[PDB]
Design a protein around this ligand. Sequence first.
Ligand SMILES: [Mg+2]
Length: 96
Amino acid sequence: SHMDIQVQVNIDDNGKNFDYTYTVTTESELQKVLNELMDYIKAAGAARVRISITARTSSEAEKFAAILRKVFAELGYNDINVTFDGDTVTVEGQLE
Ligand SMILES: [Mg+2]
């Protein structure tokens, strides 16, 4: 339903790639999933990460953008780009 939040994750590490799709119901559940992704990226290293979140309003897209900017900064990415398509925010990070 439209109460759901959709999360798309692409973790691409010099040819070792992974793709995840999640449906989360609250900001709290979104944060749970993002913290698991951070755990994985910190342990394994990922050269490129792209996370897209389809929020429920345009204001919530910006709220989730702020969460993602902080995630990517905490993970140490050196090229971080935030884009919006409707209510969907995408953030892509790379080490170079
Ligand atoms: Mg879990």
